[PDB]
Structures are given as structure tokens and as C-alpha cells.
Design goal:
Largest sheet: 7 strands, antiparallel
Structural class: mainly beta
Number of helices: 2
PDB class: isomerase
Keywords: conformation analysis, density functional calculations, FKBPs, magic methyl, isomerase
Name: Peptidyl-prolyl cis-trans isomerase FKBP5
Assembly: monomeric
Order of helices and strands: HEEEEEHEE
Entry title: The Fk1 domain of FKBP51 in complex with ((1S,5S,6R)-10-((3,5-dichlorophenyl)sulfonyl)-2-oxo-5-vinyl-3,10-diazabicyclo[4.3.1]decan-3-yl)acetic acid
Number of strands: 7
Strand content: 25-35%
Bound molecules: ligand RRZ
Radius of gyration: 14 Å
Number of domains: 1
Shape: globular
């Protein structure tokens, strides 16, 4: 399925080249511009655990998730991966625990040592 495909066939987008964040572009976005640090970014997403459970979905809430890019308001894999996206792009991200919730996890939903899968759509970004 999609998590296996991004694990086996995804691009390492880390600066360390440690395969901690892997990406596949699913839907090509607009032009060349990507958001910059500090921008307000608007996304839709879904998250799955490695046991196949969906743990989160913005579509199910009928409202995008909004954050300031590159400020540690989200797990590192998101600050790294969203920064690579064009407006309108949809991508898959595979997030090793060092770029997510680590050995702590995040009670109740995220276990210790969790690899996470996301599908993310960048809706918009504004200075
Ligand atoms: C639910 C909102 C965010 C939570 N955070 C911020 C934080 O944990 O302080 C995140 O960094 C990431 C990425 C942005 C979207 C949300 N997750 S999440 O999907 O990994 C997540 C979902 C849920 Cl239901 C619980 C938890 Cl702990 C994390």
C-alpha cells in the first residue's frame, strides 16, 4: 500500500541523508515556489500508524490545519517536508520517530518509536 511504497520508493529529503523523512509527490503543484520560514501554511492531511490505524484526519474535521512553517510548531518531518511543497501539491511522507514523536510517543494515539505515514495537501501559504 501507500506506506510501503513511500518506504521503498521515496526520496530522502533530509539534510543528514539519514532516510529519516522520505517523500513521494502524488499530485504536482503550481510553478516552482515553496513556502518560506515563517509563512502561514494551510494543509489538509491524514496520518497513519505502522499498524495501519488512521490516527488523524483534517478532512474529517471539515477544516484545514494551519501553522507557521519552520518554527517547531509541528514535528520536524513536517517542517522539513512542507517546506519542499508547491501550492496545490499532494505528497506522501514517511517519518521515522527521530523526526516525529521519538521514544516518548504522544498519549493516547502515538506509541513509542512510531514511524508515521502522512498524506499532505498544501492548500495555500501566505507571508
Ligand atoms: C493534531 C495536531 C498536530 C499535532 N502536532 C503538533 C504537536 O504534537 O504539538 C504535530 O506536529 C503533528 C503534525 C501536524 C498535525 C498534527 N500532528 S499529528 O498528526 O502527528 C498528531 C495527531 C494527533 Cl490526533 C495526535 C498527535 Cl499527538 C499528533
Amino acid at each position: 500500500g501507500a506506506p510501503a511504497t513511500v518506504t521503498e520508493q521515496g526520496e530522502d529529503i533530509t539534510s543528514k541523508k539519514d532516510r529519516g523523512v522520505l517523500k513521494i509527490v502524488k499530485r504536482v503543484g503550481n510553478g516552482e515556489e515553496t513556502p518560506m520560514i515563517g509563512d502561514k501554511v494551510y494543509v489538509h492531511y491524514k496520518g497513519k500508524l505502522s499498524n495501519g490505524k488512521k490516527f488523524d484526519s483534517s478532512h474529517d474535521r471539515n477544516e484545514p490545519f494551519v501553522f507557521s512553517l519552520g518554527k517547531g510548531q509541528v514535528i520536524k518531518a513536517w517542517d522539513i517536508g512542507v517546506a519542499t511543497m508547491k501550492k496545490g501539491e499532494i505528497c506522501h511522507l514517511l517519518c521515522k520517530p527521530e523526526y516525529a514523536y521519538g521514544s516518548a510517543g504522544s498519549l493516547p494515539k502515538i506509541p513509542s518509536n512510531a514511524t508515521l505515514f502522512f498524506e499532505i495537501e498544501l492548500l495555500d501559504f501566505k507571508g
